[PDB]
Design a protein around this motif. Structure first.
Motif, mmCIF file in Angstrom:
data_model
loop_
_atom_site.group_PDB
_atom_site.id
_atom_site.type_symbol
_atom_site.label_atom_id
_atom_site.label_comp_id
_atom_site.label_asym_id
_atom_site.label_seq_id
_atom_site.Cartn_x
_atom_site.Cartn_y
_atom_site.Cartn_z
ATOM 1 N N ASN A 90 1.527 3.559 -3.258
ATOM 2 C CA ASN A 90 0.500 4.319 -3.166
ATOM 3 C C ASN A 90 -1.334 3.784 -3.851
ATOM 4 O O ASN A 90 -1.186 4.506 -5.031
ATOM 5 C CB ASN A 90 0.223 5.459 -2.986
ATOM 6 C CG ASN A 90 -0.351 6.713 -3.115
ATOM 7 O OD1 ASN A 90 -1.788 6.804 -3.125
ATOM 8 N ND2 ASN A 90 0.163 7.801 -1.882
ATOM 9 N N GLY B 209 0.920 -1.521 -0.130
ATOM 10 C CA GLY B 209 0.326 -0.191 0.120
ATOM 11 C C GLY B 209 0.701 1.140 0.315
ATOM 12 O O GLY B 209 1.130 1.637 -0.712
ATOM 13 N N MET C 47 -3.869 5.311 -0.521
ATOM 14 C CA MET C 47 -3.877 5.422 0.942
ATOM 15 C C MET C 47 -2.673 5.183 1.373
ATOM 16 O O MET C 47 -2.218 4.276 0.623
ATOM 17 C CB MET C 47 -5.149 4.127 2.140
ATOM 18 C CG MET C 47 -6.602 3.802 1.989
ATOM 19 S SD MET C 47 -7.681 3.878 0.513
ATOM 20 C CE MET C 47 -6.876 2.607 -0.462
ATOM 21 N N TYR D 205 -1.650 3.673 4.775
ATOM 22 C CA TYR D 205 -1.823 2.981 5.615
ATOM 23 C C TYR D 205 -2.094 1.472 5.649
ATOM 24 O O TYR D 205 -2.369 1.100 4.727
ATOM 25 C CB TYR D 205 -2.903 3.307 6.626
ATOM 26 C CG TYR D 205 -2.315 4.428 7.635
ATOM 27 C CD1 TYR D 205 -1.473 4.782 8.804
ATOM 28 C CD2 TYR D 205 -3.315 5.641 6.760
ATOM 29 C CE1 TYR D 205 -1.657 6.223 8.454
ATOM 30 C CE2 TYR D 205 -3.228 7.428 7.242
ATOM 31 C CZ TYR D 205 -2.050 7.207 8.345
ATOM 32 O OH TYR D 205 -2.560 8.369 9.289
ATOM 33 N N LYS D 206 -0.822 0.514 5.925
ATOM 34 C CA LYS D 206 -1.216 -0.488 5.919
ATOM 35 C C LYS D 206 -2.604 -1.693 6.438
ATOM 36 O O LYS D 206 -3.306 -2.631 5.688
ATOM 37 C CB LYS D 206 -0.750 -1.880 6.073
ATOM 38 C CG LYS D 206 1.714 -1.088 5.803
ATOM 39 C CD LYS D 206 2.677 -1.308 6.964
ATOM 40 C CE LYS D 206 2.671 -3.385 7.212
ATOM 41 N NZ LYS D 206 3.024 -4.014 6.318
ATOM 42 N N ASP D 207 -3.386 -1.016 7.473
ATOM 43 C CA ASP D 207 -4.354 -1.572 7.738
ATOM 44 C C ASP D 207 -5.809 -1.004 7.507
ATOM 45 O O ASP D 207 -6.899 -1.410 6.739
ATOM 46 C CB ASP D 207 -4.740 -0.771 9.665
ATOM 47 C CG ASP D 207 -5.885 -2.002 9.885
ATOM 48 O OD1 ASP D 207 -6.266 -2.614 9.441
ATOM 49 O OD2 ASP D 207 -6.281 -0.847 10.641
ATOM 50 N N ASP D 208 -4.670 0.585 6.763
ATOM 51 C CA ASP D 208 -6.291 0.785 5.580
ATOM 52 C C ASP D 208 -6.024 0.590 4.609
ATOM 53 O O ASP D 208 -7.380 -0.220 3.671
ATOM 54 C CB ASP D 208 -6.252 2.517 5.211
ATOM 55 C CG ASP D 208 -7.380 3.151 5.027
ATOM 56 O OD1 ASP D 208 -7.933 2.189 4.935
ATOM 57 O OD2 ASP D 208 -7.684 4.211 5.082
ATOM 58 N N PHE D 209 -5.016 -0.188 3.900
ATOM 59 C CA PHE D 209 -5.305 -1.521 2.596
ATOM 60 C C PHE D 209 -5.455 -2.023 2.424
ATOM 61 O O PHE D 209 -6.176 -2.602 2.133
ATOM 62 C CB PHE D 209 -3.843 -1.226 2.293
ATOM 63 C CG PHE D 209 -3.409 -2.174 1.438
ATOM 64 C CD1 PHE D 209 -3.357 -3.058 0.461
ATOM 65 C CD2 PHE D 209 -3.030 -3.316 1.946
ATOM 66 C CE1 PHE D 209 -3.130 -3.681 -0.446
ATOM 67 C CE2 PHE D 209 -2.244 -4.783 1.227
ATOM 68 C CZ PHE D 209 -2.989 -4.510 0.125
ATOM 69 N N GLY E 250 -7.694 -3.593 4.837
ATOM 70 C CA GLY E 250 -9.205 -3.095 4.708
ATOM 71 C C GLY E 250 -9.911 -2.863 3.387
ATOM 72 O O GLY E 250 -11.059 -3.288 3.322
ATOM 73 N N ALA E 251 -9.492 -1.584 2.765
ATOM 74 C CA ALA E 251 -9.889 -1.621 1.363
ATOM 75 C C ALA E 251 -10.081 -2.950 1.016
ATOM 76 O O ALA E 251 -10.635 -2.941 0.179
ATOM 77 C CB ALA E 251 -9.418 -0.489 0.986
#
Ligand SMILES: *[C@@H]1O[C@H](CO)[C@@H](O[C@@H]2O[C@H](CO)[C@@H](O[C@@H]3O[C@H](CO)[C@@H](O)[C@H](O)[C@@H]3O)[C@H](O)[C@H]2NC(C)=O)[C@H](O)[C@H]1NC(C)=O
Ligand SMILES: *[C@@H]1O[C@H](CO)[C@@H](O)[C@H](O)[C@H]1NC(C)=O
Ligand SMILES: *[C@H]1O[C@H](CO)[C@@H](O)[C@H](O)[C@H]1NC(C)=O
Lengths: 1239, 527
Positions: free
Chosen positions: A611, A607, A615, A617-621, A623-624
């Motif tokens: 890019n 992530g 995002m 953020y690793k966690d945001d990636f 989740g996405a």
């Protein structure tokens, strides 16, 4: 040899193999040297300044061509040494391409393809084309015209520009109308491309960096395939270009790729074209061959030649494979035309040559070449005559190290390409950056793909590695048209080159304004100039891009905090070990959340690195990606649309009986073909518009990791340089080991990222592409079923009835399984697809497995698992269950109270493995006994065994029993259904049928529609019940239940899935144990010893005999011959289990004494007669054997040969030679289950 | 014919006719050895498969027998014996039984036309008054042939089965040398016939009377110095039967068939009967075994002529031994081991065979009858001199009976002799029934033979004196073919009728002889 009598350079001008030559040209050209090399092939040691008039200079043009890499030189080829080396190299490449059988066939096809003499304005006459011959001038003063096929000329102004040209005509387009003409190949053997490959780590995990050089043989092969297409006049129109969209910022600016290039590349690239355009081309070429055959039929005269018209007609009918029906009426047959077209198109490909040569090459044309390497081919110490750059017996042979520049550096020298690193570039701004053109996504346009799905169809009564060797066997030889005498043409042969379509120069320096950061900004933020100043890592791209001395990183904050700290002399070794360990720590991290469908290894740091999805953020990636599937990875969504498939119309023959059945059969066949065609179209669309982005992302990850390693070792060397003399000498340090270990970490991370991208692509295909096709396609099935219904009743009966409606309801209600095995080759992709379906479907009703010293259900549904006292487990592998004919030899499984329904089992399956001992007691005849029970109160199912047969019984409340049986005889010489591990599975569709499968093969189906309600058992019983035998015992393992009905595809791969080498019984082969031997090619004989020693030998004798008991069993004896024992040589595993690729020694027992097996490889002949020696033998003889096949290796690692046998005179001796069979063998451990008495 | 007869009478008997008599007795010896090698060598080489060559002889006796009267007597005999010798020598160098039998068949084709030609040849050379004697003497050579062919046979090939065996080495070729040497008399006859001249009477019949005068002068000079078209041939054969020569030929054919039936039946019946007598004596001997319990015994020697019933052979071992005429019934084997055991005429019946091993044995499946195996296994598996002697003796027995016919046929006659001989032989045949022993059989055999040679001689003379020089050969030939026919018949019936009954064949034989000896009397007188 293809090229005899090497011609040096300074041989005389005799006139038949070396002579001065006039080439056809628009104007005047001076006499030119060349050397005839074979029949109808010539090689000209001069630069191509004569064919094209516009190219009068060799200076690099001011406007560099739109090419990824190119080199220019004006003094090359000038001197005579260069001419000699050039000609030696081209001769070596010709002999090498002739060496391989596929290349041999290609060379023969080139030789036979003489152009047609259709140049007469009068229709009934044959005249040679003026522009496809060469004027050979003799020393006496006069010249003779001669025809030929190929000319090899040094390169054009652009040295590395290898291409094919042809001499056109005013009105005849020779290259595409079935006539063909001589081809001129602008080629050079002294230079090679240099590309990058990152998909080899699967085979060689110890591989370092890439930068591999393409074998010049492959390039010459590509040029030869272009020629071969052009001689038969089957070249595709150059204006037919695979157009791409170029509007967006992320879209590659532009590149021409004609369909002829796609055809000649073959393999993966050949799938970029749909079947429709291929069919159009095939039909057009068939019509053109019909036209040429008609013209040949019409013609009855010839002017300008000595030989008979009949001889030239014979030559042409052999070239075009035409058929004449003894009446002078030529005709082409669709079968031979199809065979020739397939041979020229699908057989002759770059991919097949790469596979045969076993050399590196880019799998796709997208992997643009990145360097120019000067090489030397003339000496044999650099480029072996047979195996190319990969010389055998040397370190270069292993791991394909020959093509690796960083190892074989003394062979390749890098040159400065004259295309600027950023000459063709695009501008991105938000702070502006520039991007090279060849590092962008490849976006094919929608116009390049078409479908005839909407067109309706009517059906009438009648509508409808190995293959290379079969084609070679069928291929014809010894028929090469002899050199012909022709009346000489004029002194100058006028002619213009075939006109190439104009390509407008693609715009450069385009500016794009965006509101977000693209991955190119991130990829640029990690580069640097390696200046003197200190370079600092940072977590903000906004500063790394702006400040040249600061470089972005996507790693954790503690890492950058460490790498920014100054340290002292004593601390540096700990510092470097800490940083390398930590770097491996980030590079090895994988997410454990696997609830997502077949994305099992989600890698987070992709992530912030590139890019993806906007995002940081690793966690945001994570989740996405979990929420959105694999869509977020793609830069642009590929649009897929399947219009409504056309209906099917059936003709009716009033009062017909057997033609109508043919109509329904053809309807079913065309249904299957339509399903196949739509799957093929979906796959080609996916491969065109999905795989390229994934490949680019993988390449960007590879270069990103390499850049990170570059920055790390750069800052480390900067810190290293700070020291004075005493510190640097007392404290040693080198960069080579650091580079090696960082590269190995990069490779281990790259394996994970490659696999991850593989499941991403496969999941996207399975999720967001195939449903769109399948919905329309099942609607097509619904309409077709409606039509067949209207015909099956038609409110009348003058027809031919329940069987037809049963068939149509059966096949048109189910779905054909979807597999890429029949659509793609990329092995990596193949594995991911199948492995996925089976692995995920594993989770089912009961997954009874014995691990962690207990028998548990991994499907977390089973309530309790009862274990009896009298059960047994195999010490070598705890997952085997042995059940005896005793009351406490019982296993009870408490099935989940949730999934128990009265009318359940509507669609479900069972599968397991059974080993059955050999029946002895005669009372067991007709003695049926249940082995597995799920029946209560006269309802349920049961698996039972009887004398040599397995019985699956389904039973409802209302007495309706349904028994399906699989039987096998005991009186057979070799059996696959006794004392062997047998996979058994049962599939059930309570609507239609119950089917039985054994080890993955079809046996029997019976209808279960008459079954009503079948109430579910509370539990599962594992016990012998009713078996009169007092000694009967079973072996079962890997029992599994499936809540839905299975299909042939998911069952067959399952077999292999549940399938470390095995013995005859299927159990694990074990060390330090005796074993008898058996060859599958010759089963009826056994092995025997003779006068053991160096002179001694093993041989095949018999017959093995026979052991039997009346009306119970008959079978050939198995414990015949000396027993074989296997013990560890260098395997480090503590246990005695053998696995694949294990090097071990082999010993044999003779009159209860042990002997080594070894042989002398220096003996003449490829066959290496093995021998049995005493344990105090000499280590020179090869005795190490790798592991069902076994291969003997020399003490130096050279493979002596596959262990087998050869019929040495009347004695079937044993050999280790380098046959479709004879490499298959089998080990027979002594088994109590068989019972034959040894002595 | 009167002048030719007078000049032949003046020529007399001397050196030349004796030399010719020897070089023709050579061919008669060849005929005798052919009869032997067809009736007692081929049938013991394999059964009566080879007999078919007899049928071939038939064709020869009509093809090379009737042709000579239209073409010549020296040329036809030369060609016939040459083809016989050449194809016999070819048969010597033959691999396989089929090719050898074909070669023997064509050799029989060649030789079956020798006897009529030799008799017709010698009948046109000897004096009219002293015609019965010398011709009779020739007959003995025929019999001598068989004797010689017998006497050497037992010396070279006293081992049956040499015919149906081609998998053996290049040795065991005793049959090859025997076939080579059985073509010796015909070879010497071919060497000799270059010197002998053609038939004077036949040559005069065709023409060129100057050549006939030349040969007559040569014969006279030798005696003085010593003493000091197939249409035509078929019509010729018909002229011998359905014409003026109608009753005589019918009676002669009947007599020839009767004699060649009885004689060629009994000559082969007698050795078969003696072998059956020996076989009957042998069978009378056996050890019966009941209720045995043989525990842990290793057998090495050979046990023969035994039967076992309800045996319990437990943990036995048969290694490198011979099974001879031993029978097993209701025997219960147990973990017995059979190694290198060679069996002959042994047969297992109703046996329970359990846990055994049959390694390196010839006890095939067919040797087991209604046997139940249990947990068992089957590993890799692998002189009739008297006859010749008997034959010799018989052939030898006629020698004394021949001389007493030689110097007597000019006194009693040519019709009384045959009649009496036949009847006398029939009486001896009626005494056979009484005899039942080795000595008895051979005595009867000899007796019959001794009294069964005068008939043959009388027959030969009466059949060569009747027809003229223009139908003689043809006629003789067909009667020889019919004789070969009777041979096949007797050598088939009598042979097949062994061990079933004795009176039937004997009665049959007696009848035939009586019949012939009663019809022989109704024949034109020739004295
Ligand atoms: C043919 O051979 C088979 C096997 O080679 C024989 O069956 C076997 O008979 C033995 C003796 O009864 C069984 O041994 C058993 O061993 C257990 C455990 O030690 C012991 O408790 C028992 O008392 C018994 O001794 C063996 O299990 C059995 N094998 C099988 C597969 O049934 C058979 O008897 C032989 N004969 C016939 C006619 O089949
Ligand atoms: C074979 O022997 C068994 C047991 O000894 C007996 O029951 C059976 O009737 C015998 N069969 C014959 C026909 O001999
Ligand atoms: C068989 O073995 C016995 C006992 O050892 C021995 O006496 C005998 O000589 C052997 N057989 C023969 C025929 O040599």
């Amino acid at each position: 040899p293809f090229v005899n009598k090497q011609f040096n350079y300074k041989d005389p001008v005799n006139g038949v193999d070396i002579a001065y030559i006039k080439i056809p040209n628009a104007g005047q050209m001076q006499p030119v040297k060349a050397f005839k090399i074979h029949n109808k092939i010539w090689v000209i040691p001069e630069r191509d300044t004569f064919t094209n008039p516009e190219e009068g200079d060799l200076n690099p043009p001011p406007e560099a061509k739109q090419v990824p890499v190119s080199y220019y030189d004006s003094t090359y080829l000038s001197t005579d040494n260069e001419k000699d080396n050039y000609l030696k190299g081209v001769t070596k490449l010709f002999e090498r391409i002739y060496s391989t059988d596929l290349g041999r066939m290609l060379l023969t096809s080139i030789v036979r393809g003489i152009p047609f003499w259709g140049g007469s304005t009068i229709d009934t006459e044959l005249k040679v084309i003026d522009t496809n011959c060469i004027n050979v001038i003799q020393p006496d003063g006069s010249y003779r015209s001669e025809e030929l096929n190929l000319v090899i000329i040094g390169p054009s102004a652009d040295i590395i520009q290898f291409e094919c040209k042809s001499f056109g005509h005013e009105v005849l387009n020779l290259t595409r109308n079935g006539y063909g003409s001589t081809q001129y190949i602008r080629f050079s053997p002294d230079f090679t491309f240099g590309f990058e490959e990152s998909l080899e780590v699967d085979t060689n995990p110890l591989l370092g960096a890439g930068k591999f050089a393409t074998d010049p043989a492959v390039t010459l092969a590509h040029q030869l395939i272009h020629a071969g297409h052009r001689l038969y006049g089957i070249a595709i129109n150059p204006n037919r270009v695979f157009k791409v969209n170029t509007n967006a910022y992320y879209e590659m600016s532009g590149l021409e790729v004609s369909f002829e290039e796609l055809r000649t590349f073959g393999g993966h690239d050949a799938k970029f074209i749909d079947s429709l355009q291929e069919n159009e081309f095939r039909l057009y070429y068939y019509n053109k061959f019909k036209d040429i055959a008609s013209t040949l039929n019409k013609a009855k005269s010839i002017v300008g030649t000595t030989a008979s018209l009949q001889y030239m007609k014979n030559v042409f009918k052999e070239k075009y494979l035409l058929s004449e029906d003894t009446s002078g009426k030529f005709s082409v047959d669709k079968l031979k035309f199809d065979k020739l077209y397939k041979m020229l198109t699908e057989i002759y490909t770059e991919d097949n040559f790469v596979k045969f040569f076993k050399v590196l090459n880019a799998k796709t044309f997208l992997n643009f070449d990145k360097a120019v390497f000067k090489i030397n081919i003339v000496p044999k110490v650099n480029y072996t005559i047979y195996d190319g750059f990969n010389l055998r017996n040397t370190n270069l042979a292993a791991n394909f190290n020959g093509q690796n520049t960083e190892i074989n550096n003394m062979n390749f020298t890098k040159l400065k390409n004259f295309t600027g690193l950023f000459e063709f570039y695009k501008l991105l701004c938000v702070l502006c950056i520039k991007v090279n053109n060849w590092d962008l996504f490849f976006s094919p346009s929608e116009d390049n793909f078409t479908n005839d799905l909407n067109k309706g169809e009517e059906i009438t009564s009648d509508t409808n590695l190995d293959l290379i060797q079969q084609y070679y066997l069928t291929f014809n030889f010894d028929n090469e048209p002899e050199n012909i005498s022709i009346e000489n043409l004029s002194s100058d042969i006028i002619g213009q080159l075939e006109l190439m379509p104009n390509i407008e120069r693609f715009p450069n320096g385009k500016k794009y304004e965006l509101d977000k950061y693209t991955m190119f900004h991130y990829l640029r933020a990690q580069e640097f100039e390696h200046g003197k100043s200190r370079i600092a890592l940072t977590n903000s791209v906004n500063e790394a891009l702006l400040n040249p001395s600061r470089v972005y990183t996507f790693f954790s904050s503690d890492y950058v905090k460490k790498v920014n700290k100054a340290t002292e002399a004593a601390m540096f070794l700990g510092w470097v070990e800490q940083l390398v360990y930590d770097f491996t720590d980030e590079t090895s991290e994988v997410s454990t959340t696997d609830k997502i469908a077949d994305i099992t290894i989600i890698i987070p740091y992709i992530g912030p690195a590139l890019n993806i999805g906007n995002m940081l953020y690793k966690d945001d990636f994570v989740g996405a990606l979990i929420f959105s599937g694999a869509v977020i990875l793609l830069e642009f969504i590929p649009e897929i649309a399947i219009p409504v498939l056309g209906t099917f119309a059936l003709v009716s023959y009033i009062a017909n009986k057997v033609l109508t059945v043919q109509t329904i059969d053809n309807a079913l066949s065309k249904r299957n073909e339509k399903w196949d065609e739509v799957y093929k179209y979906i796959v080609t669309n996916w491969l065109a518009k999905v795989n390229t982005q994934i490949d680019l992302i993988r390449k960007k990850m590879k270069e990103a990791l390499e850049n990170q390693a570059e920055a790390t070792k750069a800052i480390i060397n900067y810190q290293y340089n700070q020291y004075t003399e005493e510190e640097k000498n007392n404290i040693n340090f080198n960069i080579d080991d650091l580079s090696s270990k960082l590269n190995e970490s990069i490779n281990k991370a790259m394996i994970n990222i490659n696999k991850f991208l593989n499941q991403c692509s496969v999941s996207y295909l399975m999720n967001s592409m195939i449903p769109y096709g399948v919905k329309r396609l099942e609607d097509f099935d619904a309409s077709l079923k409606d039509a067949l219904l209207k015909y099956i009743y038609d409110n009348r009966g003058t027809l031919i009835v329940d069987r037809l409606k049963d068939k149509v309801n059966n096949t048109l209600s189910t779905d054909i399984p979807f597999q890429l095995s029949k659509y793609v080759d990329n092995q990596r992709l193949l594995s991911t697809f199948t492995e996925y379906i089976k692995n995920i479907i594993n989770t089912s009703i009961l997954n009874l497995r014995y691990e962690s010293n207990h028998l548990i259900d991994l499907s977390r549904y089973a309530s309790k698992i009862n274990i009896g006292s009298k059960v047994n487990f195999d010490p070598i592998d705890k997952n085997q269950i042995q059940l005896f004919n005793l009351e406490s030899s019982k296993i009870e499984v408490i099935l989940k109270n949730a999934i128990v329904y009265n009318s359940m089992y509507e669609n479900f399956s069972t599968s397991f493995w059974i080993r059955i001992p050999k029946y002895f007691n005669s009372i067991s005849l007709n003695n049926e006994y249940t082995i597995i029970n799920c029946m209560e109160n006269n309802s349920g199912w049961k698996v039972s065994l009887n004398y040599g047969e397995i019985i699956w019984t389904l039973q409802d409340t209302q007495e309706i029993k349904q028994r399906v049986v699989f039987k096998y005889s005991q009186m057979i010489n070799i059996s696959d259904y006794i004392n062997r591990w047998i996979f058994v599975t049962i599939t059930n569709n309570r609507l239609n049928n119950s089917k039985i499968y054994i080890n993955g093969r079809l046996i029997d189906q019976k209808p279960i529609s008459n079954l009503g309600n079948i109430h579910a058992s509370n539990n599962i019983m594992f016990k012998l019940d009713g078996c009169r035998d007092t000694h009967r015992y079973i072996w079962i393992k890997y029992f599994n239940l499936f809540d839905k009905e299975l299909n042939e595809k998911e069952i067959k791969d399952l077999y292999d899935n549940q399938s470390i080498l095995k013995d005859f019984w299927g159990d694990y082969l074990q060390y330090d144990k005796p074993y008898y031997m058996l060859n599958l090619y010759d089963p009826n004989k056994y092995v025997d010893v003779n006068n053991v020693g160096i002179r001694g030998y093993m041989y095949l004798k018999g017959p093995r005999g026979s052991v039997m008991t009346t009306n119970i069993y008959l079978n050939s004896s198995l414990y015949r011959g000396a027993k074989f024992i296997i013990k560890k040589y260098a395997s480090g595993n503590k246990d005695n289990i053998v696995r694949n690729n294990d090097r071990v020694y082999i010993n044999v027992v003779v009159k209860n004494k042990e002997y080594r097996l070894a042989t002398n490889a220096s003996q003449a002949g490829v066959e290496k007669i093995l021998s049995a020696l005493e344990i105090p033998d000499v280590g020179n003889l090869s005795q190490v054997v790798v592991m069902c096949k076994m291969n003997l290796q020399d003490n130096n690692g050279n493979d002596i040969g596959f262990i087998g046998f050869h019929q040495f005179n009347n004695i079937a001796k044993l050999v280790a030679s380098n046959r479709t069979l004879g490499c298959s063998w089998e080990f027979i451990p002594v088994d109590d289950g068989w019972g034959e008495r040894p002595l | 014919a009167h002048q030719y007869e007078t000049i032949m009478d003046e020529c007399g008997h001397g050196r030349f006719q004796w030399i010719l008599f020897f070089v023709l007795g050579l061919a008669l010896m060849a005929d005798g050895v052919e009869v032997f090698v067809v009736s007692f060598a081929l049938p013991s080489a394999e059964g009566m498969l080879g007999m078919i060559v007899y049928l071939g002889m038939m064709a020869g006796a009509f093809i090379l027998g009737g042709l000579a009267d239209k073409l010549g007597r020296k040329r036809v005999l030369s060609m016939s014996l040459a083809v016989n010798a050449s194809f016999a020598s070819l048969s010597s160098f033959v691999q396989g039984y089929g090719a050898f039998l074909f070669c023997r068949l064509i050799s029989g084709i060649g030789i079956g036309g020798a006897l009529p030609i030799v008799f017709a040849y010698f009948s046109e050379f000897l004096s009219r008054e002293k015609r019965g004697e010398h011709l009779s003497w020739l007959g003995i050579f025929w019999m001598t042939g068989g004797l010689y062919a017998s006497a050497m046979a037992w010396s070279i090939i006293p081992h049956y089965g040499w015919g149906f065996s081609m998998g053996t080495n290049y040795h065991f070729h005793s049959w090859r040398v025997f076939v080579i040497v059985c073509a010796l008399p015909c070879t010497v006859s071919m060497v000799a016939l270059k010197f002998m001249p053609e038939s004077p009477r036949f040559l005069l019949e065709m023409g060129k009377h100057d050549e006939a005068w030349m040969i007559l002068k040569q014969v006279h000079d030798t005696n003085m110095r010593a003493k000091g078209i197939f249409k035509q041939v078929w019509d010729n054969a018909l002229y011998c039967v359905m014409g003026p020569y109608r009753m005589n030929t019918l009676i002669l054919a009947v007599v020839w068939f009767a004699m060649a039936f009885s004689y060629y039946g009994l000559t082969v019946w007698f050795p078969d009967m003696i072998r059956y007598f020996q076989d009957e004596e042998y069978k009378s001997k056996m050890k019966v075994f009941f209720g045995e319990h043989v525990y842990g015994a290793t057998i090495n020697f050979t046990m023969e002529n035994q039967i076992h019933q309800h045996g319990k052979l437990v943990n036995d071992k048969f290694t490198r031994m011979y099974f001879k005429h031993v029978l097993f019934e209701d025997t219960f084997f147990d973990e017995c081991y059979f190694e290198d055991v060679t069996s002959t005429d042994t047969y297992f019946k109703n046996c329970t065979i359990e846990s055994t091993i049959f390694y390196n044995t010839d006890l095939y499946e067919h040797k087991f009858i209604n046997c139940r195996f249990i947990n068992s296994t089957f590993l890799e598996q692998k002189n009739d001199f008297l006859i010749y002697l008997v034959s010799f003796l018989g052939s030898l027995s006629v020698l004394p009976g021949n001389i007493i016919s030689a110097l007597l046929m000019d006194r009693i006659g040519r019709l009384k002799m045959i009649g009496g001989s036949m009847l006398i032989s029939a009486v001896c045949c009626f005494f056979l029934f009484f005899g039942n022993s080795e000595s008895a059989m051979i005595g009867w055999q000899c007796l019959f033979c001794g009294t069964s040679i005068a008939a043959w001689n009388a027959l030969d003379v009466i059949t060569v004196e009747l027809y003229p020089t223009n139908q003689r050969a043809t006629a003789f030939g067909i009667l020889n073919g019919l004789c070969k026919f009777g041979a096949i018949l007797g050598n088939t019936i009598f042979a097949s009728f062994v061990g079933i009954t004795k009176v039937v064949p004997i009665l049959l034989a007696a009848a035939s002889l009586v019949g012939g000896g009663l019809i022989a009397l109704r024949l034109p007188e020739t004295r």
